């Protein structure tokens, strides 16, 4: 049932780039609601995974400044995977998008630079080996 | 929309091999290491055959494998180095036939990261400390100690980290009686990052750092720091102390150096060169492996170079130092990764690309004709090639070469689909054909007039190993025969076989029993006629032979039992049981030599209600129970591995039942609409069954498990065993109006193959639809051709003539007369821009070639396709791409050409027609709608047949990457990008323009693509990521493609294809891998089918951890998460669990363990 | 960044056995020469 968010995310990006800059006074409120639902540990993993591409794959101007300062919103579930618990949804599936999060950034630079690469090296080393 | 992972073939490539004693016996065995599969095998000096002991998948990438020994112990331990952040210790139990985990110590992160050890692993040969370290910044020391209970204990690793340091190789150096001593090559790169000019890159030498450990003060300190001159690769473990000096042999580039701590000067010894070598002198020659042989008399080592030359290092040691190093030419073997020398004169060479062989040492090579080479002689030596002369072919295995392309289709007149594998390496390549069944071998073919229907095999004695009488029966006649290696008609048998004999068994020690419906005549060895007449005119329908009992069945449902009296006569029971049906089958198991006799008896009836008949006199001729039957049976038998009940019917079914008076399990499999006859056969000592259908079916037992492997043969009606001097283990199978003898040498479980010699590694091949032919293109890196080698030899011959040595140069004739084979002695070809392009058409039915068309040396073929044009009629065209000026390290190309062939006589003769230039080497050609499309690099164009040049109709430039694959269909064109996942392009007919409307968000290194239907497009990956992309129905025929299933196999998959495997089932995604395994994907039908296996996957992750300590979910979801795919590899290990744990799992699922295993085998039963 | 990403890519080639197997196929070399070349390229990526 994960096609529901994929269609919503595709439409979310569609309205972001089509005409969302004419009289859009909510253009900042849509961004504001993103960290209100994501940057809080009281929410479950289902909605936490629902905002993994709603911020990164929307540009790079006001995106990198958000992803960097957070430490207690991504490292918590990374080391909470070897627990032998009930059914999960994003304990290993959310790691796919964070690897993808270092793809577009590297492509833009090929055409925080050293610190970002060093920080990503301690999280996933296969990202720089599968695609450069 | 759901998939199930199932594999049939496994990785047969050896990456790491060790030698030692792990089973506790006195016979040596080898433990091989695959990429992620642990296989155990042992040799056999008696028969020279090697059989697999146990194959368990560890679900983890193994990076190293080695062993050690304890002081005063008797059993070795297994240490496995993987990509995880933990080390494991294994102890195989021969009785349990399983690997038991001893310790599990997690120290750091897992995966293929920078700070993960596992690649390099070394131990003190005395058995006190072991070293594991990563490439950089990490060095760990584990201390092994045991208590008074003879139990091995492991302590915490020691912190010996050193940042900004590069580790080349770690080896365990044995130095007399002292602390475990370690030598390694270290490198510093601090100056390289601080010198942008480039001066720090030059003249950068490495050191040989020696580490000393203290067991009392618990510290690690660097003792020696000795810089080197040239770069090193690995060290040879040379034992010291009593036997040999305590030193190490460092292999270098074109040189070898011995270095020992103290007052030992360095020894320099150059490596010789083969006479008048055609290779580039600027190229080097290095070593790939080093074997250690521990012999009480003398010690010597073996090495291997790139050219397959074996040099033995013999040391004339002093009291403490060494004198010199000696070298000699001994043997010639193909290119191998690592070899292990075994005791009692055995040498196993484990190849890295090709088949695995097993050589036997026959001669030590003492005082040969070729002089040895040492270091004391000054000055650039040379050696002459020599044949093997020492090793012979003993054993061979069905090792699968890495596969670059595969294709499954129907090319023979039979309905069984054949599998074609294009693999190999250069001259050792072979386009082998895979067949599902066993290897059918014939020894003698004879013709017998009449209609043979039964052949018997009676031995002289029960415990003998040779036969005494063979009888062949007919519908009306019978002839007697005997075996004397001059088999003809025998006369003094004394059988009087005028009447059709139903059966010829062995009742007495050397007596035979013949069955005829006019009376039973016992044929004794002594001149005694024990003829029993049949009361009345009634006849007999079947028989039941036994070692100590005689059972018959008269017409109308009448049963008479005979008992074998030890005095010499026979008795008859005083009661006949009445039955309501007609006897259709009869069977009885053999009397156990240890026990008294058998009790369970099964009688087939038309009423389809089989009843168990007791054999004891207390309850003789009495009903016991009843069991329902589907239809009228045809044959029945009782197999003992533990007895089992087997039921055969008149149609293509095979029913199996456990030994139980009450009805139990009911397992069936398709066997045909033919009467199935089940016989008694012997293989591997245990009993087995042999059913008959349109194809012969065999079901034997292996590792306490019953399989179902059919036989590649036509319809048969009768079969029996065979045992003589020529073939101790054979099977006799009579055919239509002829006599044939079969044998079973190779086990041949699945995927038998036949080899065919080739010249270069084929890339792709296309099946000719009409004349059933193939088109094969060949290209290899640094390859030559016949013309280039011929002119090089002539130029080389002229140069030596020009040299005019002291005219006195008579070796010109000998150089051109004696030529060495390329497949076994290697290929002496060098250069940078040297290639080959061989186009060959081979008939799959035969093994010979049809035409050989060669091309220029600087030309290579990467793609081939068959196209049609509307201007011509039913003519078939062949187009082969040409590569020009390929440069590896920098990106600099020059272009290519496309060759058009007439294809004279539908794939029997090729001729040159014309040429056309292109700006880039083509990669994939796919015609559609009567025209041809060739992807020229980043530019996508549509071509058409012209007079001199291909007419251009459209041009595309939106593709900013290299096109690696083009798949076309009647509506759209699917483009497989090397960087992007998929590009969907539609080409119009009236507009004539390539339109790009959709793409994919996920970047993938797509190697190949396949089409399942109109909407689904599959794709592979360089690492083994298989995904299927579904496009929404609303597409502009803004369109970012979604993904419904993503799964990582863990091994490189280079081909995807979906077809029907066996007639009578559904299709499945059959894909092979680069390791050499074949995996299938089983689709699901109902919701509960996926739910039950989902619960099994959830339960087995916690109830059965992997052997090497690797997390199951993240290992499969390494690159991409696993979606809509259920792993069946973990479910296959359900039979390798303790019964108490299995009982708990079954009760958790509210089922029984027999039923759980039935569904596990049912998945393979349906689609395989 | 260039140094960090290069050192995280070339060093991961040896961990995978099939990636090493693929490297030994594209070139007429053995697994020994392949692992030496990647190890000698660490001096200046």
PDB file of C-alpha atoms in Angstrom, chain B residues 479-614:
ATOM      1  CA  UNK B 479      16.896 -68.046 -24.161  1.00  0.00           C
ATOM      2  CA  UNK B 480      19.562 -68.713 -21.520  1.00  0.00           C
ATOM      3  CA  UNK B 481      22.791 -66.703 -21.368  1.00  0.00           C
ATOM      4  CA  UNK B 482      25.884 -66.408 -19.184  1.00  0.00           C
ATOM      5  CA  UNK B 483      28.724 -63.954 -18.563  1.00  0.00           C
ATOM      6  CA  UNK B 484      32.294 -64.973 -19.353  1.00  0.00           C
ATOM      7  CA  UNK B 485      33.519 -61.846 -21.177  1.00  0.00           C
ATOM      8  CA  UNK B 486      32.641 -63.843 -24.331  1.00  0.00           C
ATOM      9  CA  UNK B 487      28.875 -63.804 -23.775  1.00  0.00           C
ATOM     10  CA  UNK B 488      27.081 -66.301 -26.026  1.00  0.00           C
ATOM     11  CA  UNK B 489      24.360 -68.926 -25.641  1.00  0.00           C
ATOM     12  CA  UNK B 490      25.142 -71.372 -22.828  1.00  0.00           C
ATOM     13  CA  UNK B 491      24.121 -75.039 -22.912  1.00  0.00           C
ATOM     14  CA  UNK B 492      24.885 -76.657 -19.527  1.00  0.00           C
ATOM     15  CA  UNK B 493      22.593 -74.296 -17.593  1.00  0.00           C
ATOM     16  CA  UNK B 494      19.869 -76.940 -17.324  1.00  0.00           C
ATOM     17  CA  UNK B 495      16.825 -74.662 -17.171  1.00  0.00           C
ATOM     18  CA  UNK B 496      14.447 -75.947 -19.897  1.00  0.00           C
ATOM     19  CA  UNK B 497      13.100 -72.454 -20.471  1.00  0.00           C
ATOM     20  CA  UNK B 498      10.609 -73.317 -23.203  1.00  0.00           C
ATOM     21  CA  UNK B 499       7.688 -71.497 -21.539  1.00  0.00           C
ATOM     22  CA  UNK B 500       7.455 -67.765 -20.778  1.00  0.00           C
ATOM     23  CA  UNK B 501       8.956 -67.194 -17.329  1.00  0.00           C
ATOM     24  CA  UNK B 502       7.302 -64.520 -15.194  1.00  0.00           C
ATOM     25  CA  UNK B 503      10.201 -64.039 -12.760  1.00  0.00           C
ATOM     26  CA  UNK B 504      13.659 -65.450 -11.981  1.00  0.00           C
ATOM     27  CA  UNK B 505      14.627 -64.693  -8.380  1.00  0.00           C
ATOM     28  CA  UNK B 506      17.202 -66.002  -5.891  1.00  0.00           C
ATOM     29  CA  UNK B 507      15.401 -68.079  -3.261  1.00  0.00           C
ATOM     30  CA  UNK B 508      18.229 -70.379  -2.184  1.00  0.00           C
ATOM     31  CA  UNK B 509      21.941 -69.713  -1.930  1.00  0.00           C
ATOM     32  CA  UNK B 510      22.518 -70.755  -5.558  1.00  0.00           C
ATOM     33  CA  UNK B 511      19.006 -71.665  -6.747  1.00  0.00           C
ATOM     34  CA  UNK B 512      16.542 -70.020  -9.119  1.00  0.00           C
ATOM     35  CA  UNK B 513      12.739 -69.954  -9.177  1.00  0.00           C
ATOM     36  CA  UNK B 514      10.743 -69.785 -12.411  1.00  0.00           C
ATOM     37  CA  UNK B 515       7.068 -68.802 -12.533  1.00  0.00           C
ATOM     38  CA  UNK B 516       4.671 -70.099 -15.195  1.00  0.00           C
ATOM     39  CA  UNK B 517       0.859 -70.252 -14.945  1.00  0.00           C
ATOM     40  CA  UNK B 518       0.904 -74.038 -15.542  1.00  0.00           C
ATOM     41  CA  UNK B 519       3.006 -74.836 -12.466  1.00  0.00           C
ATOM     42  CA  UNK B 520       5.880 -73.669 -10.283  1.00  0.00           C
ATOM     43  CA  UNK B 521       9.244 -75.390 -10.806  1.00  0.00           C
ATOM     44  CA  UNK B 522      12.044 -74.785  -8.303  1.00  0.00           C
ATOM     45  CA  UNK B 523      15.457 -74.956  -9.998  1.00  0.00           C
ATOM     46  CA  UNK B 524      17.988 -76.184  -7.435  1.00  0.00           C
ATOM     47  CA  UNK B 525      21.737 -76.378  -7.947  1.00  0.00           C
ATOM     48  CA  UNK B 526      21.559 -80.084  -7.107  1.00  0.00           C
ATOM     49  CA  UNK B 527      19.823 -82.426  -9.558  1.00  0.00           C
ATOM     50  CA  UNK B 528      16.439 -82.220  -7.834  1.00  0.00           C
ATOM     51  CA  UNK B 529      13.205 -81.385  -9.666  1.00  0.00           C
ATOM     52  CA  UNK B 530      10.936 -79.625  -7.157  1.00  0.00           C
ATOM     53  CA  UNK B 531       8.003 -79.246  -9.536  1.00  0.00           C
ATOM     54  CA  UNK B 532       4.687 -78.136  -8.024  1.00  0.00           C
ATOM     55  CA  UNK B 533       1.622 -78.490 -10.236  1.00  0.00           C
ATOM     56  CA  UNK B 534      -1.240 -75.995 -10.342  1.00  0.00           C
ATOM     57  CA  UNK B 535      -4.562 -77.466  -9.131  1.00  0.00           C
ATOM     58  CA  UNK B 536      -7.107 -76.873 -11.882  1.00  0.00           C
ATOM     59  CA  UNK B 537      -6.986 -75.002 -15.168  1.00  0.00           C
ATOM     60  CA  UNK B 538      -6.639 -71.562 -13.551  1.00  0.00           C
ATOM     61  CA  UNK B 539      -3.585 -69.429 -14.305  1.00  0.00           C
ATOM     62  CA  UNK B 540      -1.432 -66.897 -12.453  1.00  0.00           C
ATOM     63  CA  UNK B 541      -1.426 -63.140 -13.013  1.00  0.00           C
ATOM     64  CA  UNK B 542       1.479 -61.831 -10.913  1.00  0.00           C
ATOM     65  CA  UNK B 543       4.266 -62.951  -8.571  1.00  0.00           C
ATOM     66  CA  UNK B 544       5.912 -61.979  -5.281  1.00  0.00           C
ATOM     67  CA  UNK B 545       9.544 -63.033  -4.990  1.00  0.00           C
ATOM     68  CA  UNK B 546      11.448 -62.935  -1.709  1.00  0.00           C
ATOM     69  CA  UNK B 547      14.668 -64.293  -0.234  1.00  0.00           C
ATOM     70  CA  UNK B 548      12.860 -66.509   2.302  1.00  0.00           C
ATOM     71  CA  UNK B 549       9.198 -66.455   1.199  1.00  0.00           C
ATOM     72  CA  UNK B 550       7.222 -67.350  -1.928  1.00  0.00           C
ATOM     73  CA  UNK B 551       3.899 -65.597  -2.599  1.00  0.00           C
ATOM     74  CA  UNK B 552       1.572 -66.258  -5.544  1.00  0.00           C
ATOM     75  CA  UNK B 553      -1.920 -65.096  -6.495  1.00  0.00           C
ATOM     76  CA  UNK B 554      -4.378 -67.128  -8.563  1.00  0.00           C
ATOM     77  CA  UNK B 555      -7.235 -65.842 -10.711  1.00  0.00           C
ATOM     78  CA  UNK B 556     -10.486 -64.871  -9.034  1.00  0.00           C
ATOM     79  CA  UNK B 557      -8.802 -63.544  -5.897  1.00  0.00           C
ATOM     80  CA  UNK B 558      -7.027 -66.576  -4.422  1.00  0.00           C
ATOM     81  CA  UNK B 559      -3.841 -66.308  -2.346  1.00  0.00           C
ATOM     82  CA  UNK B 560      -1.427 -69.162  -1.585  1.00  0.00           C
ATOM     83  CA  UNK B 561       1.692 -68.641   0.534  1.00  0.00           C
ATOM     84  CA  UNK B 562       4.771 -70.869   0.410  1.00  0.00           C
ATOM     85  CA  UNK B 563       7.333 -71.026   3.201  1.00  0.00           C
ATOM     86  CA  UNK B 564      11.027 -71.790   2.769  1.00  0.00           C
ATOM     87  CA  UNK B 565      11.871 -74.745   5.030  1.00  0.00           C
ATOM     88  CA  UNK B 566      15.564 -74.872   6.025  1.00  0.00           C
ATOM     89  CA  UNK B 567      15.492 -78.658   5.536  1.00  0.00           C
ATOM     90  CA  UNK B 568      15.224 -78.125   1.777  1.00  0.00           C
ATOM     91  CA  UNK B 569      11.552 -78.514   0.868  1.00  0.00           C
ATOM     92  CA  UNK B 570       8.639 -76.064   0.770  1.00  0.00           C
ATOM     93  CA  UNK B 571       5.292 -75.991   2.573  1.00  0.00           C
ATOM     94  CA  UNK B 572       1.856 -74.579   1.766  1.00  0.00           C
ATOM     95  CA  UNK B 573      -0.511 -72.685   4.053  1.00  0.00           C
ATOM     96  CA  UNK B 574      -3.771 -74.475   4.877  1.00  0.00           C
ATOM     97  CA  UNK B 575      -6.051 -71.515   4.051  1.00  0.00           C
ATOM     98  CA  UNK B 576      -6.819 -69.322   1.027  1.00  0.00           C
ATOM     99  CA  UNK B 577      -8.108 -65.774   1.511  1.00  0.00           C
ATOM    100  CA  UNK B 578     -11.051 -64.746  -0.668  1.00  0.00           C
ATOM    101  CA  UNK B 579     -11.028 -61.346  -2.354  1.00  0.00           C
ATOM    102  CA  UNK B 580     -13.583 -59.249  -4.223  1.00  0.00           C
ATOM    103  CA  UNK B 581     -11.276 -57.850  -6.929  1.00  0.00           C
ATOM    104  CA  UNK B 582      -8.585 -58.932  -9.400  1.00  0.00           C
ATOM    105  CA  UNK B 583      -4.869 -58.822  -8.606  1.00  0.00           C
ATOM    106  CA  UNK B 584      -3.138 -56.102 -10.627  1.00  0.00           C
ATOM    107  CA  UNK B 585       0.191 -55.675  -8.792  1.00  0.00           C
ATOM    108  CA  UNK B 586       2.229 -57.472  -6.144  1.00  0.00           C
ATOM    109  CA  UNK B 587       5.364 -56.589  -4.199  1.00  0.00           C
ATOM    110  CA  UNK B 588       7.430 -57.464  -1.131  1.00  0.00           C
ATOM    111  CA  UNK B 589      10.591 -56.066   0.433  1.00  0.00           C
ATOM    112  CA  UNK B 590      13.765 -58.060   1.028  1.00  0.00           C
ATOM    113  CA  UNK B 591      14.433 -59.904   4.289  1.00  0.00           C
ATOM    114  CA  UNK B 592      16.849 -57.929   6.508  1.00  0.00           C
ATOM    115  CA  UNK B 593      20.031 -59.913   7.220  1.00  0.00           C
ATOM    116  CA  UNK B 594      20.112 -58.698  10.828  1.00  0.00           C
ATOM    117  CA  UNK B 595      16.428 -58.952  11.702  1.00  0.00           C
ATOM    118  CA  UNK B 596      14.174 -61.987  11.306  1.00  0.00           C
ATOM    119  CA  UNK B 597      11.897 -61.107   8.374  1.00  0.00           C
ATOM    120  CA  UNK B 598       9.448 -58.535   7.018  1.00  0.00           C
ATOM    121  CA  UNK B 599       5.806 -58.100   8.006  1.00  0.00           C
ATOM    122  CA  UNK B 600       4.220 -55.346   5.891  1.00  0.00           C
ATOM    123  CA  UNK B 601       2.723 -56.682   2.649  1.00  0.00           C
ATOM    124  CA  UNK B 602       0.813 -54.671   0.034  1.00  0.00           C
ATOM    125  CA  UNK B 603      -1.535 -56.127  -2.596  1.00  0.00           C
ATOM    126  CA  UNK B 604      -2.983 -54.063  -5.425  1.00  0.00           C
ATOM    127  CA  UNK B 605      -6.593 -54.589  -6.462  1.00  0.00           C
ATOM    128  CA  UNK B 606      -9.147 -53.257  -8.923  1.00  0.00           C
ATOM    129  CA  UNK B 607     -11.269 -52.230  -5.916  1.00  0.00           C
ATOM    130  CA  UNK B 608      -8.566 -49.607  -5.168  1.00  0.00           C
ATOM    131  CA  UNK B 609      -8.581 -50.511  -1.452  1.00  0.00           C
ATOM    132  CA  UNK B 610      -5.105 -51.791  -0.601  1.00  0.00           C
ATOM    133  CA  UNK B 611      -4.875 -53.824   2.608  1.00  0.00           C
ATOM    134  CA  UNK B 612      -1.874 -54.625   4.792  1.00  0.00           C
ATOM    135  CA  UNK B 613      -1.299 -58.391   4.953  1.00  0.00           C
ATOM    136  CA  UNK B 614       0.596 -59.941   7.845  1.00  0.00           C
TER     137      UNK B 614
END
